[PDB]
């Protein structure tokens, strides 16, 4: 309990709720940062191809890798590479969004705006990438 990052675990159990968000961030970032750092330095040592490792290291890497996964914002990351694959602003320039990052109903209802521009390539763009459903796709192959 004397550990610097363990007592912060106790104080959230004892009190909190009323405690402002700044301290809820200061007492909660520590465990995640420590886990991430340990995972990085422990995975940087082994090899890459899984046909060149022993039995224990395979399971160790498989269990330890999941701490670094990302699931939500993959599209924004991958947008860059598709541009070069196919080829070879300041918010105000966007339509449907005000400077305060809120929707502009006036333009939407008057100018008859078909699509709201979240990211780049919303302007023009023939790459498509249209949303599909996993279950129908799985039923197609079988």
């Amino acid at each position: 309990m004397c550990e610097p990052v363990s007592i912060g675990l106790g104080i959230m159990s004892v009190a909190g709720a009323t405690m402002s968000a700044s301290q809820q961030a200061k007492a909660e970032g520590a465990a995640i940062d420590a886990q991430n750092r340990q995972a990085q330095e422990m995975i940087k040592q082994m090899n890459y191809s899984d046909a060149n490792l022993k039995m224990q290291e395979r399971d160790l890497k498989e269990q330890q890798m999941a701490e670094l996964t990302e699931t939500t914002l993959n599209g924004i990351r991958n947008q860059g590479m598709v541009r070069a694959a196919v080829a070879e602003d300041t918010v105000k320039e966007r339509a449907g969004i005000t400077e305060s990052y809120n929707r502009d109903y006036a333009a939407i209802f008057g100018n008859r705006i078909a699509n709201i521009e979240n990211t780049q390539s919303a302007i023009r763009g023939q790459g498509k990438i249209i949303k599909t459903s996993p279950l129908a796709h799985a039923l197609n192959v079988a």
Binding site: I76, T119, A122, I129
Partner: peptide, 17 residues
């Protein structure tokens, strides 16, 4: 509780009058 989240869409399609 807690359901799997949903990725942010790239663009939205709307309708009018």
């Amino acid at each position: 509780s807690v359901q799997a989240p949903e990725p942010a869409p790239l663009s939205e399609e709307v309708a009018s009058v």
